[PDB]
Amino acid sequence: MFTGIITDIGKVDRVKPLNEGVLLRIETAYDPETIELGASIACSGVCLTVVALPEKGSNARWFEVEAWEEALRLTTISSWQSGRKINLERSLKLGDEMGGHLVFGHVDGQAEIVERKDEGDAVRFTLRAPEELAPFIAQKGSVALDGTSLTVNGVNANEFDVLLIRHSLEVTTWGERKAGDKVNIEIDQLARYAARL
Amino acid sequence: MFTGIITDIGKVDRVGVLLRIETAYDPETIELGASIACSGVCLTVEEALRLTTISSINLERSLKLGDEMGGHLVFGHVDGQAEIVERKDAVRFTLRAPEELAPFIAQKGSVALDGTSLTVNGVNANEFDVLLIRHSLEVTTWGERKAGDKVNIEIDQLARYAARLAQYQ
Amino acid sequence: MFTGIITDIGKVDRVKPLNEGVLLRIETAYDPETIELGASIACSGVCLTVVALPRWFEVEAWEEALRLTTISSWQSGRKINLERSLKLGDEMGGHLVFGHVDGQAEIVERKDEGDAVRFTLRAPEELAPFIAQKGSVALDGTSLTVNGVNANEFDVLLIRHSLEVTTWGERKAGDKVNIEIDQLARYAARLAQY
């Protein structure tokens, strides 16, 4: 699992279509020696499996992942092209600190940014959630948006707000986000227990 | 994230505002930027001083992957303060919560008071009771608590999800 | 907190009186090296704290738990449902259980129903409004779906497997079980009463 604390901003280097899937090569600051084949890396909130790493002796820093039919459909990955910057988070190991919330990287769908407002040390983003997810977005609840652990600041029907402190905008893809952008949305464990009920 | 099971009593040495806290915790097991619940307030190693008892302690380390969640899901984001009105020797404490927090307090439901995960015993409007066992009064700041004293209150996040479900429907 | 999915059938080995209060020694299939002092273990739905370890573990049931739950009747040889606390990273299923029981219900009838067994239970009147068809309830710490309600009585259907892997196989008409109302249903009723 993950926490929603982004540790790198990766860059989509290569996009190769597969039968009902895609192969992505992601440029990273992570050391590929510390990455295991088959490890899970959250790519803008999407849990994906590492399928390839640079050969022995190479100085290149990248990893390849595959995204299949369901992920291409539900998530923003269908839109990703070469040059796309994405949030990265490595999987948590037994005993690791968890600074955000419990993030599985099992994206529920997409939310749309409908407004972006500067508020001094933070930017307030207003998003539109899919109607099916809306009853499970509660004020003070933990939400993962492009893999970023955020607190729901306020709700208004299918709309909800999140506050992003300036530093978060610099160290995540949130700095690039604008009205009209789609982001991956994952509801927390508590909202899911309310959602299954 | 926390579970409300207190593992240390911290004595405040020197005192927004920066505070120094003595602990039985091994500093070698602690890193910078890390979160620790100080009487229910999640703190990083103005808004807080206003809502919390900090203006005038129980300790819990953040849950790590694999840790058992023996209490309930405590976030360490305090909602306000509750007042102890009577202490009836396990020891029963009657508290008075702010009007805004009373609908989120239910009989046999969960509450986090000074970071302690407690089961709500009885409820009468904004007044509620908690039963604090002998062991808990010694391993927490609950021993020195009496009528008039103010505690940090964190209502159950599950109650907000129940309210949102009913507000939408 | 717990999931209401029973992981072992424990056997009470020793009951030692205390002021409150009892010390229970429970035989288990759990590896005591995986248990730490102070760990919470749901014992037939009652959240109890581990006080000693060497397979068995020892818990203390205080006054309120002793008197309100079926623990007052537990003697050596008693089989109980066991469940370890949920760990951070584990999935929370459809029904979260906290192990703070509301009281006891009594099995008034047990009847075979093909590949399952239908138990009818009587609930205390204070609990009956919280019990709703299709709702989940923890009975002896086992998460079960309320199949139907009829005033202060309700039914649960237990599939053959659940009878084998929990203490439900040996339950009979007249037995008392611990009952815990669903957490979300209590918040919903508390919010509605406003």
Side-chain angles (χ1 to χ4, degrees), chain A residues 170-189:
Chain A
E170 318 186 1
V171 302
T172 73
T173 62
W174 282 92
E176 258 197 305
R177 290 303 158 245
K178 53 216 167 193
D181 284 352
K182 305 256 161 44
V183 305
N184 291 321
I185 184 168
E186 175 180 9
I187 69 174
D188 67 4
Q189 286 195 119

mmCIF file of all heavy atoms in Angstrom, chain A residues 170-189:
data_model
loop_
_atom_site.group_PDB
_atom_site.id
_atom_site.type_symbol
_atom_site.label_atom_id
_atom_site.label_comp_id
_atom_site.label_asym_id
_atom_site.label_seq_id
_atom_site.Cartn_x
_atom_site.Cartn_y
_atom_site.Cartn_z
ATOM 1 N N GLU A 170 4.862 22.707 -5.498
ATOM 2 C CA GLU A 170 6.209 22.642 -6.089
ATOM 3 C C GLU A 170 6.721 21.233 -6.180
ATOM 4 O O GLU A 170 7.489 20.954 -7.079
ATOM 5 C CB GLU A 170 7.229 23.438 -5.257
ATOM 6 C CG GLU A 170 6.658 24.755 -4.779
ATOM 7 C CD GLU A 170 7.568 25.725 -4.060
ATOM 8 O OE1 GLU A 170 8.773 25.414 -3.890
ATOM 9 O OE2 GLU A 170 7.059 26.809 -3.681
ATOM 10 N N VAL A 171 6.413 20.392 -5.192
ATOM 11 C CA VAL A 171 6.948 19.023 -5.137
ATOM 12 C C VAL A 171 5.978 17.943 -5.670
ATOM 13 O O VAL A 171 6.237 16.745 -5.526
ATOM 14 C CB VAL A 171 7.562 18.674 -3.764
ATOM 15 C CG1 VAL A 171 8.686 19.661 -3.401
ATOM 16 C CG2 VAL A 171 6.491 18.606 -2.667
ATOM 17 N N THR A 172 4.852 18.369 -6.242
ATOM 18 C CA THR A 172 3.914 17.443 -6.868
ATOM 19 C C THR A 172 3.491 18.098 -8.163
ATOM 20 O O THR A 172 3.734 19.286 -8.340
ATOM 21 C CB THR A 172 2.652 17.153 -6.038
ATOM 22 O OG1 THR A 172 1.784 18.286 -6.069
ATOM 23 C CG2 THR A 172 2.922 16.681 -4.616
ATOM 24 N N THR A 173 2.779 17.354 -9.019
ATOM 25 C CA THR A 173 2.203 17.884 -10.261
ATOM 26 C C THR A 173 1.065 18.894 -10.017
ATOM 27 O O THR A 173 0.579 19.489 -10.963
ATOM 28 C CB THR A 173 1.757 16.759 -11.188
ATOM 29 O OG1 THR A 173 0.741 16.016 -10.551
ATOM 30 C CG2 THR A 173 2.902 15.864 -11.589
ATOM 31 N N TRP A 174 0.641 19.083 -8.780
ATOM 32 C CA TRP A 174 -0.414 20.050 -8.490
ATOM 33 C C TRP A 174 -0.079 21.495 -8.932
ATOM 34 O O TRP A 174 -0.995 22.250 -9.242
ATOM 35 C CB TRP A 174 -0.868 19.972 -7.032
ATOM 36 C CG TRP A 174 -1.770 18.790 -6.842
ATOM 37 C CD1 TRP A 174 -1.400 17.523 -6.468
ATOM 38 C CD2 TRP A 174 -3.167 18.730 -7.146
ATOM 39 N NE1 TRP A 174 -2.489 16.687 -6.505
ATOM 40 C CE2 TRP A 174 -3.595 17.410 -6.890
ATOM 41 C CE3 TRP A 174 -4.116 19.687 -7.571
ATOM 42 C CZ2 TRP A 174 -4.918 17.004 -7.096
ATOM 43 C CZ3 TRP A 174 -5.428 19.293 -7.745
ATOM 44 C CH2 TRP A 174 -5.825 17.970 -7.513
ATOM 45 N N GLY A 175 1.211 21.828 -9.025
ATOM 46 C CA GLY A 175 1.650 23.150 -9.477
ATOM 47 C C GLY A 175 1.262 23.451 -10.915
ATOM 48 O O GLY A 175 1.079 24.608 -11.284
ATOM 49 N N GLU A 176 1.096 22.408 -11.719
ATOM 50 C CA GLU A 176 0.742 22.493 -13.132
ATOM 51 C C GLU A 176 -0.759 22.470 -13.344
ATOM 52 O O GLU A 176 -1.198 22.657 -14.476
ATOM 53 C CB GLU A 176 1.318 21.246 -13.835
ATOM 54 C CG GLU A 176 2.591 21.447 -14.632
ATOM 55 C CD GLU A 176 2.842 20.298 -15.598
ATOM 56 O OE1 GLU A 176 2.878 19.135 -15.138
ATOM 57 O OE2 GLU A 176 2.969 20.557 -16.817
ATOM 58 N N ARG A 177 -1.544 22.084 -12.311
ATOM 59 C CA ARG A 177 -2.982 21.874 -12.464
ATOM 60 C C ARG A 177 -3.785 23.131 -12.692
ATOM 61 O O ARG A 177 -3.532 24.138 -12.048
ATOM 62 C CB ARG A 177 -3.583 21.042 -11.324
ATOM 63 C CG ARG A 177 -3.152 19.559 -11.363
ATOM 64 C CD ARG A 177 -3.492 18.823 -12.675
ATOM 65 N NE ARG A 177 -2.582 17.688 -12.718
ATOM 66 C CZ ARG A 177 -1.627 17.496 -13.613
ATOM 67 N NH1 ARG A 177 -1.547 18.270 -14.685
ATOM 68 N NH2 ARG A 177 -0.820 16.457 -13.508
ATOM 69 N N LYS A 178 -4.747 23.047 -13.603
ATOM 70 C CA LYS A 178 -5.614 24.178 -13.943
ATOM 71 C C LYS A 178 -7.048 23.748 -14.094
ATOM 72 O O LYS A 178 -7.317 22.558 -14.263
ATOM 73 C CB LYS A 178 -5.098 24.918 -15.207
ATOM 74 C CG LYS A 178 -4.858 24.036 -16.434
ATOM 75 C CD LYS A 178 -3.644 24.524 -17.237
ATOM 76 C CE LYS A 178 -3.185 23.522 -18.269
ATOM 77 N NZ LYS A 178 -1.841 23.864 -18.803
ATOM 78 N N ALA A 179 -7.982 24.715 -14.068
ATOM 79 C CA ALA A 179 -9.398 24.443 -14.270
ATOM 80 C C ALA A 179 -9.582 23.677 -15.578
ATOM 81 O O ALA A 179 -8.897 23.959 -16.569
ATOM 82 C CB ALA A 179 -10.189 25.756 -14.296
ATOM 83 N N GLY A 180 -10.420 22.653 -15.549
ATOM 84 C CA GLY A 180 -10.623 21.809 -16.724
ATOM 85 C C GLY A 180 -9.809 20.522 -16.696
ATOM 86 O O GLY A 180 -10.107 19.580 -17.431
ATOM 87 N N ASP A 181 -8.759 20.464 -15.853
ATOM 88 C CA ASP A 181 -7.948 19.246 -15.752
ATOM 89 C C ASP A 181 -8.694 18.132 -15.039
ATOM 90 O O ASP A 181 -9.485 18.394 -14.120
ATOM 91 C CB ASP A 181 -6.632 19.521 -15.022
ATOM 92 C CG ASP A 181 -5.593 20.254 -15.840
ATOM 93 O OD1 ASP A 181 -5.816 20.446 -17.053
ATOM 94 O OD2 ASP A 181 -4.548 20.606 -15.283
ATOM 95 N N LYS A 182 -8.448 16.887 -15.463
ATOM 96 C CA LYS A 182 -8.995 15.731 -14.781
ATOM 97 C C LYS A 182 -7.875 15.136 -13.903
ATOM 98 O O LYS A 182 -6.689 15.135 -14.269
ATOM 99 C CB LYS A 182 -9.506 14.675 -15.768
ATOM 100 C CG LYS A 182 -10.526 15.247 -16.761
ATOM 101 C CD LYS A 182 -11.967 14.846 -16.435
ATOM 102 C CE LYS A 182 -12.985 15.746 -17.112
ATOM 103 N NZ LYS A 182 -12.652 16.042 -18.534
ATOM 104 N N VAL A 183 -8.253 14.703 -12.713
ATOM 105 C CA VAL A 183 -7.326 14.086 -11.773
ATOM 106 C C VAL A 183 -7.915 12.725 -11.339
ATOM 107 O O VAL A 183 -9.127 12.567 -11.331
ATOM 108 C CB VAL A 183 -7.019 14.991 -10.551
ATOM 109 C CG1 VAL A 183 -6.511 16.382 -10.975
ATOM 110 C CG2 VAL A 183 -8.228 15.103 -9.638
ATOM 111 N N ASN A 184 -7.059 11.764 -10.969
ATOM 112 C CA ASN A 184 -7.501 10.468 -10.464
ATOM 113 C C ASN A 184 -8.017 10.659 -9.056
ATOM 114 O O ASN A 184 -7.435 11.448 -8.311
ATOM 115 C CB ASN A 184 -6.313 9.482 -10.489
ATOM 116 C CG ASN A 184 -5.944 9.145 -11.919
ATOM 117 O OD1 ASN A 184 -6.824 8.989 -12.761
ATOM 118 N ND2 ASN A 184 -4.663 9.124 -12.254
ATOM 119 N N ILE A 185 -9.139 10.009 -8.715
ATOM 120 C CA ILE A 185 -9.708 10.072 -7.374
ATOM 121 C C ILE A 185 -9.842 8.670 -6.748
ATOM 122 O O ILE A 185 -10.344 7.728 -7.386
ATOM 123 C CB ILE A 185 -11.024 10.894 -7.303
ATOM 124 C CG1 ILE A 185 -11.546 11.019 -5.851
ATOM 125 C CG2 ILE A 185 -12.115 10.364 -8.271
ATOM 126 C CD1 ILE A 185 -12.704 12.076 -5.675
ATOM 127 N N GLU A 186 -9.365 8.553 -5.504
ATOM 128 C CA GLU A 186 -9.510 7.376 -4.675
ATOM 129 C C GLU A 186 -10.092 7.775 -3.296
ATOM 130 O O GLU A 186 -9.470 8.553 -2.572
ATOM 131 C CB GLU A 186 -8.191 6.620 -4.551
ATOM 132 C CG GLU A 186 -8.289 5.440 -3.597
ATOM 133 C CD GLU A 186 -7.036 4.618 -3.413
ATOM 134 O OE1 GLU A 186 -5.956 5.027 -3.898
ATOM 135 O OE2 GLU A 186 -7.144 3.543 -2.785
ATOM 136 N N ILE A 187 -11.270 7.205 -2.913
ATOM 137 C CA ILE A 187 -11.861 7.510 -1.600
ATOM 138 C C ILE A 187 -11.154 6.671 -0.515
ATOM 139 O O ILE A 187 -10.661 5.595 -0.840
ATOM 140 C CB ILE A 187 -13.412 7.416 -1.602
ATOM 141 C CG1 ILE A 187 -13.909 5.941 -1.771
ATOM 142 C CG2 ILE A 187 -14.016 8.377 -2.672
ATOM 143 C CD1 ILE A 187 -15.414 5.724 -1.644
ATOM 144 N N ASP A 188 -11.044 7.164 0.750
ATOM 145 C CA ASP A 188 -10.334 6.407 1.806
ATOM 146 C C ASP A 188 -11.076 5.155 2.268
ATOM 147 O O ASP A 188 -12.168 4.879 1.777
ATOM 148 C CB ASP A 188 -9.926 7.286 3.002
ATOM 149 C CG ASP A 188 -11.057 7.836 3.842
ATOM 150 O OD1 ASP A 188 -12.217 7.488 3.574
ATOM 151 O OD2 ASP A 188 -10.780 8.663 4.740
ATOM 152 N N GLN A 189 -10.481 4.407 3.220
ATOM 153 C CA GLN A 189 -11.082 3.191 3.753
ATOM 154 C C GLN A 189 -12.418 3.480 4.453
ATOM 155 O O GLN A 189 -13.360 2.732 4.247
ATOM 156 C CB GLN A 189 -10.130 2.466 4.708
ATOM 157 C CG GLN A 189 -8.987 1.755 4.010
ATOM 158 C CD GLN A 189 -8.310 0.767 4.930
ATOM 159 O OE1 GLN A 189 -8.279 -0.442 4.662
ATOM 160 N NE2 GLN A 189 -7.779 1.258 6.053
#
